Design a protein around this ligand. Structure first.
Ligand SMILES: [Zn+2]
Ligand SMILES: [Zn+2]
Ligand SMILES: [Zn+2]
Lengths: 103, 71, 149, 1165
RNA sequence: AACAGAUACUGACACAGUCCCUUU
RNA sequence: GUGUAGUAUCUGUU
């Protein structure tokens, strides 16, 4: 997601695994969050696709439902040839929201 | 973060970058491009009577220490 | 963004409005105009509409010396889109003047722009580099390109 | 303004020529790689000829190519590394005749980058892993494996990166079922970039490193790293495991070394030097390529030298320890960039510049007259000699280094020819390329009469040669037969008194005589079924068949005959007559699938053809009708799914799909047209005759229409004999001719004339149509200098006190090595040689020759005339002196003037004029000339002692490359800037520039399309068109209106017309041997249609090697107003499902799209 | 220039989420 | 309605 500067990409060398998206993140681009013209499949590194993490959401980590894709603009800009777009951080909004809810 | 992405790649500079190393990167990339394409190598091997293997060997030799020693 | 190819017929209609928006009076107007420029340039890529895109680049370039992160991101996105649509030669010509500026706060911005240009399509930068006259001890001229059959 | 890119000839320059088993059979094929074309070749194992099966285009720069097979497998695969950041595995399909992509994986950005792999493509000898590497820091390993479904799979890449290192070569090590290992020639540069003194640049040596792939732990680790002595350039893999030892052979300058890890003392052997070599002793000596011929009995290597000598390396070893290396001289061939030795004893030599050759190894070259050399022996010499261990069987024509082209009409033909100046070094030549198929005449016999129709029916069906040759006169006949002596048979049983109209093959051995009085049947056996047609209205037309005799009378009175197994004639009681006569009619060949010929087509005066069914129930009863724009002339039916070629009274050929009713009609362009069916390349073709010969062949299910390159003929008949199995017996100008078309030679028949050096430019003398050619080479000797050097060397060798009395000097001065076979004695980086040649282009014989001195490098030529004189031609040659290329520096220059009196056949010296720099361009204008010396532009006029300078200008940015002028406007090409517009003012004598460009360009050539438009090429392979704004007065800038990327450097742009009656086009030729054109659209609807077709094909038919077509065409500048025609024409070879899908997206049927795509090509070219 | 207060604006930013090793 | 990152403009005290 491009709306949170704190998040961090893994972007290691990609493997043969295919990324997945949950219900909330379905139909989006893993780089810019765009609903227009999915173009190319998303692949992730074998460290991300291991054990419990297998078949989870690329963006937030929820249960995987549908495949991930790159939008046409990212493919034109060759932003797809950069490594696994899996997010490794947990974010500041999520933890604070959880703590506020569990107040 | 954009700066982590650009840091890893070889060839990118920053504020405290000198001219010699910039042109060294230019020359190395130019030699690699010459090696890559085919008709440009044919041009170089016709301009001077040398076999393509000799031209490739010379270009590879020039990759180490181009543009002279540093300051 | 929604219309990719059939958007070259409406660049003329919105060009004066974009020029008005990109004027140095307010930050958000320039931010959103830069976003429009980025999306339009990515859309019209490959269909030979570089004439108006050059004018839009000329109008959007003076905004890179900003400090707010959102405007910075919008301007960098617009510059990347214009680099894709126009070609690395024009962007290299633009960024080639301040790359060794005496001020420290200008070289870093020019180097960020140059790195963004360089990571994408460096093999074109090979053919688009400027001639440098060599120094007393260092050879700076690529004599191989001057061979003539 | 949109243009449409087309190609007439593809590149013929081989870069990689790997070999293996790709068809899955026991026959081996060769997969060669042009710059961007992937081609597969199959040499004939009986006649030695090489054939082509697939010529797919990949739209990318191929950087590496290797093949492998999995253990226990039979079919090999193909691995491709290219400019796209992907690795692709391919697989040949003999059934579909196409390449299928099996896998592709992305690992980085696109383009020929420094730190993106794709340069080296080492593969495991067994087939367990593959490795792709970059020039710097990047190495990735993939693991290949098979599944339960008998399909290959690929694993995730394994990284083996290393900072601040350079890679020279990477090869796979044969380890024999152990952990796969890879060896590389690494070299570090970390410290050398940190030593201001500069000694750290020295004392840095290559290190041989081994990378072992740990299959158990799934990671790659480097184990051994030993410094080397010299600098190696490439490695060789030694067959190990069960046969031979492991390790790699390292090739360096003047050395070859064997090394192996663990415990091994290395062995070094010096490379033998040529005896009595004329080269400078300063230079070194390296190998260029190699090969391997491992076999159960033993294995040996082959190696190629710079001079062109093939050695034969044999390793001598203990039980497991190697002891010595044994080098022996095998033969000498032209220098090549890749060699491959196959089974059956064949050697394929892919020359890096020029033609390609195929040799058959007759002897292995052991214990022969020549001695051997070994590392155990304590600088060896050898005597080169003509071929002994090789025999040439085939040659593949190619024009790899095309340097200058000029389309004109220097002969008396009506069609322009192409005069190319290809070639490099002593193998350079000038060729005459003209559209058409080559014709070879063998035997010509004169017939004193007017032969109108001849046939070549065989005596029997199982006979392999045509025994009957019935030459028919106007009122008489002439019978002939095939044999060593062709004569006239008298006792043949044929009544030779009435003219013959056709010769049928009714039975296995039966023939009939067709005359304008009926038909008499004369079978080979003693049986004649005579059947005359009494009356003033005799038979007019005739249609022979393998089992039928269908004829007709006046008024369209058709006659039908059928053969029964008994051997009689069946006449139907029907004589249906139409209102008009027959203009053309014939039967089709009898196919085994159906009983007989499917249908009969009869052309009529009313221009309506009728397709009469051959069933007795509806005999002589039509079933359909078809009209024609003009008078029908022939109705030949071509086989191979069939079509029907129609002849017309006007010079247009019409093809109709096989059907009783008319279907898709294809038209192609004042005399009657006659078609004859012959056997071409094992395929049934046709031969039309409209104004010249026209042979339409269905080669690989593709239809071509290319004329036979010969003078006009009239009649033809197929030829079959032991000497010439495939040919034509033709009659023209009342003589008997023999034709032979064995080699295909699709288009642009070639006739070459040899040269001495690399040609630079040539001009045409307008009065006499003669060429003035200037040649120049670097690192070369003139004749006199090399002769004097030879004399000095012989004197020194005599004085060397080798017994004071040595007889070797006579042999040495009597020893002359043919330079076109043994190469040229390269000397040094400052030497040059040049020569000026006046050549007749109709027949390539020199009419004059002028040799310059040492270090005289010609760079310009011009044929002009001056105002001060009248009828006085002149030749101006620009010459350099003491030119150093890489440390660029020159010492002066000169300009020569000649006189050219005797019809442009003599060159007598007039004077020479010193200049301060090298004159790069000379262009006459307005009775004077321009000479561009360095960055200075000057005007000169003829005098008596020298040329006098009038005007000058010193504002050109850099070196001046070329000059083009029109009217009072002259355009200046620059080495780095694009174009400069400068005007000459006569009243003031000032040259002032008024318009230039914005984008710098390394232009190599320029052509003027109009008063304001210039088309310029580029060093990097781009083509651009630039136009000056209309409101310009001769500061100001020019606007770019077109961009493109051919992918191959262009050295000639020229606008002219190729086919008579067509439209002019912008013909260009490139440095790799390709010939293409750019054409405009005749309608806006056509432009939108082609644009949409290109978009859809780009969408659903991506490039084979993983590149992006639009990104490829926008490699340096974004593409503008050019539509790629190769991608568009790729539609015609796609799968039917995709074809119908795309066509329905086009709102057309696939045949309509095919016709639309073909029409523009057949119009412009 | 630093400390503090107030008012507007951007990010198709998010809303019992849920934890998916927590070890003997 | 609330919380997570930022930004701009005003006012008071040194
Ligand atoms: Zn990852
Ligand atoms: Zn999600
Ligand atoms: Zn995207």
């Amino acid at each position: 997601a491009k709306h949170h500067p704190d998040l961090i990409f893994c972007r290691k060398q990609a493997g043969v695994a295919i990324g997945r998206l949950c219900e909330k993140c379905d139909g989006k681009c893993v780089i810019c969050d765009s609903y227009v013209r999915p173009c190319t499949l998303v692949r992730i590194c074998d460290e991300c696709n291991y054990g419990s993490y297998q078949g989870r959401c690329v963006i937030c980590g929820g249960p995987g439902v549908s495949d991930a894709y790159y939008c046409k603009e990212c493919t034109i800009q060759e932003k797809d040839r950069d490594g696994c777009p899996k997010i490794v951080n947990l974010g500041s909004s999520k933890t604070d929201l959880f703590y506020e809810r569990k107040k | 973060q954009l700066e982590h992405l650009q840091s890893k790649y070889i060839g990118t500079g920053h504020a405290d970058t000198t001219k010699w190393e910039w042109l060294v990167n230019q020359h190395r990339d130019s030699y690699c491009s010459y090696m890559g394409h085919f008709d440009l190598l044919n041009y170089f091997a016709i301009a001077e009577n040398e076999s393509k293997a000799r031209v490739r060997f010379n270009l590879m030799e020039k990759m180490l220490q181009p543009c002279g020693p540093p300051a | 963004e929604y219309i990719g190819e059939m958007g070259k017929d409406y660049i003329y209609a919105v060009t004066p409005l974009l020029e008005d928006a990109l004027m140095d009076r307010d930050l958000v107007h320039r931010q959103t105009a830069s976003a429009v420029v980025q999306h339009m340039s990515l859309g019209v890529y490959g269909f030979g509409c570089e004439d108006s895109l050059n004018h839009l680049l000329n109008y959007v370039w003076p905004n890179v010396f900003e400090t707010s992160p959102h405007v910075i991101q919008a301007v960098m996105g617009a510059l990347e889109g214009l680099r894709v649509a126009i070609g690395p030669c024009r962007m290299l010509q633009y960024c080639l003047q301040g790359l060794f500026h005496p001020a420290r706060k200008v070289r870093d911005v020019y180097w960020k722009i140059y790195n963004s240009i360089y990571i994408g399509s460096q093999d074109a930068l090979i053919a688009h580099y400027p001639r440098i006259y060599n120094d007393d001890k260092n050879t700076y001229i690529r004599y191989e390109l001057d061979y003539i059959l | 303004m949109f243009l449409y890119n087309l190609t007439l000839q593809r590149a013929t320059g081989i870069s990689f020529a790997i070999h293996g088993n790709f068809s899955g059979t026991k026959q081996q094929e060769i997969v060669v790689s042009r710059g961007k074309i992937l081609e597969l070749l199959r040499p004939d194992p009986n006649t030695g000829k090489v054939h082509t099966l697939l010529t797919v285009e990949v739209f990318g720069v191929i950087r590496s190519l290797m093949a492998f097979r999995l253990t226990g497998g039979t079919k090999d695969y193909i691995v491709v590394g290219s400019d796209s950041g992907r690795i692709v595995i391919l697989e040949y399909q003999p059934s579909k005749n196409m390449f299928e992509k099996i896998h592709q994986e992305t690992f980085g950005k696109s383009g020929c980058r420094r730190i993106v792999p794709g340069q080296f493509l080492a593969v495991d000898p067994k087939g367990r892993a593959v490795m792709i590497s970059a020039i710097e820091k990047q190495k990735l390993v993939y693991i290949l494996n098979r599944d339960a479904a008998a399909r290959l799979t690929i694993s995730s890449p394994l990284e083996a990166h290393k900072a601040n290192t350079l890679v020279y070569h990477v090869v796979g090590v044969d380890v024999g079922f152990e952990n796969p290992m890879f060896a590389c020639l690494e070299m570090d540069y970390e410290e050398a970039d940190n030593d201001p003194t500069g000694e750290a640049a020295a004392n840095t040596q290559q290190t041989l490193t081994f990378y072992e792939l740990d299959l158990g732990l799934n990671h790659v680790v480097r184990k051994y790293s030993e410094p080397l002595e010299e600098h190696g350039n490439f490695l060789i893999t030694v067959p190990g495991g069960s046969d031979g030892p492991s390790g790699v052979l390292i090739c360096s300058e003047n050395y070859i070394t064997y090394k192996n890890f663990g415990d091994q003392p290395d062995i070094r052997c010096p490379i033998p030097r040529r005896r009595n070599d004329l080269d400078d002793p300063e230079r070194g000596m390296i190998f260029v390529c190699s090969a391997t011929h491992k076999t159960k009995s033993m294995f040996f290597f082959l190696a190629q030298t710079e001079q062109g000598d093939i050695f034969k390396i044999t390793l001598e070893t203990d039980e497991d320890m190697v002891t010595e290396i044994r080098l022996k001289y095998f033969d000498t061939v032209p220098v090549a960039a890749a060699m491959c030795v196959l089974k059956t004893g064949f050697l394929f030599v892919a020359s890096e510049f020029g033609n390609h050759y195929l040799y058959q190894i007759a002897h292995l070259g052991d214990d022969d007259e020549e001695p051997e050399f070994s590392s155990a022996m304590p600088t060896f010499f050898f005597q080169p000699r003509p071929l002994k261990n090789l025999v040439l069987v085939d040659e593949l024509d190619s024009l790899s280094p095309i340097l200058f082209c000029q389309i004109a009409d220097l002969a008396n033909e009506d069609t322009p020819q192409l005069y190319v100046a290809c070639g490099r070094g002593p193998r350079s030549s000038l060729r005459v390329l003209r559209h058409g198929l080559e014709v070879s005449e063998m035997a010509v016999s004169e017939l004193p009469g007017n032969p109108n129709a001849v046939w070549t029916v065989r005596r029997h069906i199982e006979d392999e040669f045509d025994a009957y040759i019935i030459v028919s006169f106007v009122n008489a006949t002439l019978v002939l037969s095939i044999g060593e002596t062709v004569e006239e048979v008298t006792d043949s049983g044929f009544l030779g008194t009435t003219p013959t109209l056709s010769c049928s093959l009714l039975g296995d051995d039966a023939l009939v005589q067709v005359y304008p009085d009926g038909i008499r049947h004369i079978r080979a056996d003693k049986r004649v079924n005579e059947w005359k047609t009494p009356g003033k209205k005799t038979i007019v037309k005739c249609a022979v068949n393998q089992r039928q005799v269908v004829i007709a009378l006046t008024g369209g009175e058709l006659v039908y005959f059928e053969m029964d197994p008994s051997g009689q004639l069946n006449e139907y009681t029907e004589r249906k007559e139409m209102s008009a006569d027959v203009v053309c009619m014939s039967l089709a060949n009898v196919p085994p699938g159906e009983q007989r010929s499917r249908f009969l087509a009869v052309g009529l005066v009313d221009n309506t053809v009728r397709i009469i069914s051959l069933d007795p129930s509806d005999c002589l009863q039509p079933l359909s009708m078809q009209a024609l724009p003009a008078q029908p002339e022939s109705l030949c039916i071509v086989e191979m799914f069939l079509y029907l070629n129609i002849g017309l009274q006007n010079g247009v050929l019409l093809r109709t799909v096989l059907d009783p009713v008319t279907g898709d009609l294809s038209d192609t362009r004042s005399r009657p047209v006659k078609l004859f069916r012959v056997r071409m390349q094992g395929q049934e073709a046709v031969l039309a005759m409209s104004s010249r010969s026209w042979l339409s062949y269905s080669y690989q299910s593709r239809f071509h229409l290319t004329p036979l390159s010969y003078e006009t003929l009239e009649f033809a008949s197929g030829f079959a004999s032991e000497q010439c199995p495939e040919g034509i017996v033709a009659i023209s100008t009342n003589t008997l001719r023999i034709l032979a078309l064995e080699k295909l030679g699709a288009v642009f028949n070639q006739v070459a004339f040899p040269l001495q050096y690399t040609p630079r430019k040539f001009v045409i003398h307008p009065e006499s149509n003669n060429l003035i050619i200037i040649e120049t080479d670097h690192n070369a000797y003139t004749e006199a200098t090399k002769a004097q050097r030879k004399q000095q060397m012989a004197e020194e060798m005599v004085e060397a006190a080798g017994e004071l009395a040595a007889e070797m000097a006579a042999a040495f001065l009597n020893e002359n090595l043919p330079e076109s076979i043994f190469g040229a004695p390269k000397a040094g980086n400052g030497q040059w040689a040049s020569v000026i040649r006046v050549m007749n282009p109709i027949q390539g014989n020199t009419l004059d020759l002028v040799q310059l001195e040492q270090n005289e490098a010609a760079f310009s030529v011009a044929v002009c005339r001056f105002s001060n004189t009248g009828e006085d031609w002149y030749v101006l040659v620009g010459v350099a002196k003491d030119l150093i290329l890489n440390p660029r520096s020159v010492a002066g220059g000169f300009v020569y003037t000649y006189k050219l009196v005797n019809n442009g056949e003599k060159l007598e010296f007039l004077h020479k004029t010193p200049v301060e720099e090298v004159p790069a361009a000379i262009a006459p204008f307005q009775g004077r000339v321009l000479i561009g010396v360095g960055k200075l532009l000057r005007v000169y006029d003829l005098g008596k002692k020298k040329l006098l300078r009038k005007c000058e200008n010193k504002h050109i940015a850099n070196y001046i490359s070329g000059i083009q002028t029109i009217g009072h406007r002259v355009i200046v090409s620059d080495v780095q800037e694009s174009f400069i517009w400068v005007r000459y003012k006569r009243n003031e004598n000032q040259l002032i520039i008024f318009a230039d460009d914005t984008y710098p360009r390394w232009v190599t050539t320029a052509s003027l399309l109009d008063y304001d438009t210039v088309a310029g090429a580029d060093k990097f392979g781009n083509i651009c068109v630039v136009r000056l704004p209309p409101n310009t007065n001769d500061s100001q800038k020019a606007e770019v209106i077109m961009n493109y990327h051919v992918g191959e450097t262009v050295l000639s742009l020229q606008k002219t017309t190729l086919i008579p009656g067509g439209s002019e086009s912008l013909v260009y030729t490139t440095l790799s041997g390709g010939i293409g054109i750019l054409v405009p659209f005749t309608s806006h609807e056509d432009h939108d249609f082609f644009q949409h077709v290109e978009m859809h094909l780009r969408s659903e038919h991506p490039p084979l090697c993983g590149r992006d077509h639009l990104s490829f065409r926008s490699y340096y500048f974004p593409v503008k107003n050019v539509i790629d025609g190769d991608l568009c024409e790729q539609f015609n070879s796609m799968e039917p499902n995709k074809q119908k899908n795309v066509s329905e997206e086009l709102d057309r049927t696939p045949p309509e799209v095919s016709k639309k795509l073909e029409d523009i090509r057949t119009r412009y070219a």
